[PDB]
Amino acid sequence: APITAYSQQTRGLLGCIITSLTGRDKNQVDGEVQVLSTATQSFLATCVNGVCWTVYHGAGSKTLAGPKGPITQMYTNVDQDLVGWPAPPGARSMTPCTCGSSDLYLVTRHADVIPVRRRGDSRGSLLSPRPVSYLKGSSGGPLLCPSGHVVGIFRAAVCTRGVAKAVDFIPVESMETTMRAS
């Protein structure tokens, strides 16, 4: 395959609770995609041009625990379901796609890379439907073009009877539009 991924855990349940409370995370950061957790749920952030982007429905208005204490969001767009923190030192920052490809790859929290065909500005179909359970906890994950650049971040699954056949996503252009208006 072209694009491949693996994950590495860094913190367990106890570490997560404490870190949530102190807002201070001293762990080394690495990787293009951060696996995030609050008290109640898990999701992903994709690092694009120095900013960690994720979904508002996961992060709300919360700070991100960091090496110098809590990191305030620098972009918050409720209607777009989009938030961003400045990326901590160590994060591998990706580049937006400029090739316009409609052949996408979605990266899940399990580090699977799955084929998506773009069907609209914010919608792609899954070439092979999956149980929605497989996609839970993956909101905020990148949709990449064949060159591995960011087209968008995964927002919600379009499902029938617990089966996801398509995904709604936030185009990498919305990130731009949010940063302008700010």
Binding site: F43, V55, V132, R155, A156, V158, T160
Partner: peptide, 6 residues
């Protein structure tokens, strides 16, 4: 179609 936030 159900829209399910993930």
């Amino acid at each position: 179609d159900d829209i399910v936030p993930c």
